[PDB]
Structure 1
Amino acid sequence: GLNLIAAHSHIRGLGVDADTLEPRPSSQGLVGQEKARKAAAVVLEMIKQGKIAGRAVLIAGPPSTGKTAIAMGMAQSLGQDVPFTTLAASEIFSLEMSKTEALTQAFRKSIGVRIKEESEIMEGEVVEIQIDRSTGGAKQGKLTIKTTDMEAIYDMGSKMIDAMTKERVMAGDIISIDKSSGKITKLGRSYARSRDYDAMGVDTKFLQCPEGELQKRKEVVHTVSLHEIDVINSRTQGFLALFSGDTGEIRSEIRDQINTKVAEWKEEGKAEIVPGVLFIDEVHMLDIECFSYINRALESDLAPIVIMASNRGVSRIRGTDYKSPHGLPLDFLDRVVIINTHPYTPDELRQILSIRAQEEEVDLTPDALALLTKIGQEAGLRYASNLITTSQLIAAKRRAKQVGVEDVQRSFKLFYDPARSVRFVQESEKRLIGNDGVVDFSY
């Protein structure tokens, strides 16, 4: 489909025993990281429980240690029931809005208003439409519709006859009508009438006739974020800015009104509030102004849980000239509990490579899997994982049905790991442009 195979495609969840929060040694595509997966599951539990507001969790550990994978596993194990917002910290440096506004909108996106509503929908196959159009138009008309269980005839009001003519509704068409709006969606063409559709090309699909009553109440459960309500109220087509962007800085008094109204809907029982998650990937790309805003944004009642990942050691905080762990100021780190990811053992690399060789359509011979495991220890999990794809493509060039050591050796030879890449750089320093701008082009 339109989803291709990607680095996290094998992550199907968090892989944790829901009855105990005990991490299974592997399941759902996660291998090892047990203590981190347990902690992320305790966070997952209190996300679903909703009662706790505005806690920040940092996931800290070396690169390629499963920090994003654990974040993806939580998103896959929350699903649609909870808003999940993913933010690269690079994203808030907008030219449309100040970074605290962008960071506000991200917090607003992570709280859902859940609104439960009903409508009568009428659905069936058009048996015939008569419209007289009596110079003039839309004067009078009759509609016959059937399911497999019933047939009925309707006199149409004139603004419904406009809708029918607007949708060019025809005998044999399977339609739904939402009654209160009066919109008509043509779900398809009935197969029994296929002969009538002489203008439709042979690529046209057909459907069986609907089933049950012509009319029923269908309940829709909308969830709309606080950010969407904020943007809707900004201007006469405010929602149109939810797509194009081009929201301004939304005025604070609009948000404060909306918070009061959402508290009314909660107290009136018309809506539920559904606290989500904001995941800030590589949070160290934020600067000292951002962290100061976050500190008090987390103290709001309508704050999500915030989950964060950092590669960084003791490192220079952006927008200042001093260093702190993770590159995060200690005053912010005071508000944050930290989950650590550790490096993988060779058998865990073997398992992750196996899983990655299941998600990609690749057969590894046992010696090729052993060699990729050895390469994974020497050159890192990510590089050996990129040799999997390379080896399959080389094997297919030699038309092999399974990837052999020869294909992995060709991969290792053709594509350098980071360490050999650095060593190549440390040897080529006269041909590569130095930090001084100096370079020699002669042989």
Structure 2
Amino acid sequence: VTRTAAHTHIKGLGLDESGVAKRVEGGFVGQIEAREACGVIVDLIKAKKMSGRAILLAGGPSTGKTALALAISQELGPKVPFCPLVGSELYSVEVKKTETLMENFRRAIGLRIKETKEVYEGEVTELTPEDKTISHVIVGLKSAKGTKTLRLDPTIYESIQREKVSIGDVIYIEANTGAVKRVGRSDAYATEFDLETEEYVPLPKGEVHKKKEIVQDVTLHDLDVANARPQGGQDVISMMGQLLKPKKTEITEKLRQEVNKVVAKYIDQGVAELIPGVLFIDEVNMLDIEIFTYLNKALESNIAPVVVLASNRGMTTVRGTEDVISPHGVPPDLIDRLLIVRTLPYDKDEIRTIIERRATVERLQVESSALDLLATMGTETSLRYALQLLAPCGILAQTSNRKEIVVNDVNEAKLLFLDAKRSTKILETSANYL
């Protein structure tokens, strides 16, 4: 019915209007300071004034860093663009790491436009060539409420010839982009043949020409790709043009600046509104120093959206550096522009509440005793393991027909499945490398 993977029990940060964090809200227990400082960041993003600001959260495993970083994306809303990213993805064979890192900054800033498109539809009456050069064609499209004739470009005529349209077939033509679609043969010709493979559609209702406006939102990078490379079109020259250079290429700063300028000229008319976004990078400790040092210069730019980093480590050597040792696997020069949000580990009671709420969202009934066993488990092994054993216990309860989890079932699940500490103990004493 409803698929749940390590999530969906968190509906947001759950902060009041004063900024105070409740003990329990939206699938969150404890971690009050991190939710408060996170909500401050939410309001900062809603303010839009700051740019190029970076905030990283450092905490142990299972402490809820990522789970808290999903709550801010839920709090911003679907209208604000969010770009989840992993530090291991910045390594690409086709393009260099630097271009892939700069691209995401352009993908993180959404820009919504509004534009009106013209639409023509009707049954075709006459088709004539006006024929060096491919001549135009006069089209006789017949609306239900009227009749109008229109001259067409030679290219859209080529698309028409490739669609095998004929006299008396309903077609659909887009004005701006020149797209051509055929709905089917008109319904009045259905009796011409007793057996035919072509379906019959009714005559389009209304006038030939129709208009409307769309609020459609397009990310800024998606707008940049349009200017950078050609895109699909019904003409052959379009397919050959896009098939000439399918491999992605690095964009120069000049084209980016010009696209930014036409974006400004679009915002001057009041047609569009530029809104920032959040770039989230998981496991920043996996980044090479070449990406960090480029993050030093890239965050100083004005168009750089707010970025959030997550790393769990002690004092460690930065990847790609020989003798450099810095906290959280991040260079000391980059850590200056970063603000830190610290995370704390949960106590026994908070683990018990976590397993409780996760059990309620998983839709499973747990008795008090087996729940206490799951808490003791969670204390003696890990927090993730107690949440992991929940489903197998329910499966064994399905095999025993019981509707609630029992101590015997969670004990049997302890016997059938092992955690890391037991498996390491089996690893220390073994015959050949178990």
Answer whether TM exceeds 0.5 for this pair: yes
Report the alpha carbon displacement of residue 177 of structure 1 after superposing the two structures with TM: 8.1
Partner of 1:190: none
Q: Provide the C-alpha distance between the structure 1 equivalents of 2:398 and 2:67, rounded to a whole number of angstroms.
A: 30
Question: Which residue matches 1:411?
Answer: 413
- Do the aligned partners of 1:14 and 1:28 also contact (CA within 8 Å) in 2? yes
The answer to whether 1:224 aligns with 2:219 is yes
Shift of 1:216: 6.4
Q: Kindly report which structure 2 residues correspond to 1:9-158, keeping only aligned pairs within 5 A, or say none.
A: 9-17=8-16, 19-119=17-117, 131=125, 152-155=145-148, 157=150
Contact 2:15 2:22 in 1 (8 A): yes
Distance in 1, matches of 2:306 and 2:36, equals 17
* Correspondence 1:432 to 2:433: yes
| Counterpart Cα distance in 1 of 2:305 and 2:330 | 20
Checking the alignment, whether the CA contact within 8 Å between 2:108 and 2:219 is kept in structure 1 is no
How far apart in 2 are the matches of 1:95 and 1:245?
A: 15
Deviations 1:118-167 (A, max 9, x none): 346799xx9xx6857799xx98767566xxxxxx455465869998x969
User: Structure 1 residue 376: deviation in Å?
Assistant: 1.2
Q: Which runs of structure 2 are paired with 1:34-433 in the superposition (5 Å)?
A: 34-119=32-117, 131=125, 152-155=145-148, 157=150, 217-225=212-220, 227-237=221-231, 246-320=247-321, 321-428=323-430, 430-432=431-433
CA drift at 1:83: 1.5
Query: C-alpha distance in 2, partners of 1:58/1:35?
Result: 14
* Residues 377 and 246 (structure 1), Cα distance of their counterparts in 2 relative to 1, 3 Å cut: farther
Residue pair 2:397, 2:404 contacting (<8 A) in 1 also: yes
Query: Equivalents in 2 of 1:21, 1:122: separation in Å?
Result: 54
Percent identity between matched residues is 40
Shift of 1:328: 0.9
Shift of 1:14: 1.7
Could you tell me how far apart the structure 1 residues matched to 2:14 and 2:205 are?
40
For residues 186 and 60 of structure 1, the distance between their equivalents in structure 2, rounded to whole angstroms, comes to: 57
**Helix, strand or coil for the counterpart of 1:64?**
coil
User: Match for 2:305: what amino acid?
Assistant: P
Q: Which residue of 2 aligns with 1:192?
A: none
CA contact (8 A) 1:121 1:218 kept: no
TM-score by length of 1: 0.77
**RMSD over aligned Cα atoms:** 4.2
Deviation at 1:222, TM superposition (A): 1.8
What is the alpha-carbon distance in structure 2 between the residues aligned to residue 20 and residue 113 of structure 1?
A: 31
| Alpha-carbon offset, residue 415 of structure 1 | 1.2
- 1:60-118 deviation line (CA, Å, top 9, x unaligned): 10001110101111111223221111110001111112211111111111112221223
Distance 2:107 2:395 in 1: 42
Contact in 2 for aligned 1:276/1:304 (Cα 8 Å): yes
Distance 1:396 1:298 in 2: 54
SS of the counterpart of 1:81? coil
3-state SS, counterpart of residue 308 of structure 2: strand
Q: 1:141 to 1:255 in 2, by over 3 A?
A: closer
- In 2: Cα distance, 1:132 partner to 1:238 partner: 29
Of stretches 262-271 and 390-399 in structure 1, the one that deviates more from structure 2 is: 262-271
Counterpart CA distance in 2 for 1:168 and 1:21 is: 64
**Paired amino acid for 1:217:** K
How far apart, CA to CA, are the structure 1 residues paired with 2:173 and 2:74?
35
Q: Which residue does 2:7 correspond to in 1?
A: 8
Shift of 1:257: 2.3
Query: Following TM superposition, by how much is the alpha carbon of 1:346 offset from its aligned partner in structure 2, in angstroms?
Result: 1.9
Q: Which amino acid aligns with 1:248?
A: T
Q: Which amino acid aligns with 1:278?
A: L
Offset of residue 32 of structure 1: 1.8
CA–CA distance in structure 1, aligned partners of residues 205 and 408 of structure 2: 58
User: Shift of the alpha carbon at 1:268?
Assistant: 4.4
Q: Secondary structure at the match of 1:22?
A: coil
Q: CA deviation at 1:215?
A: 6.0
| Amino acid across the alignment from 1:250 | I
How far is the alpha carbon of 1:286 from its aligned partner? 0.9
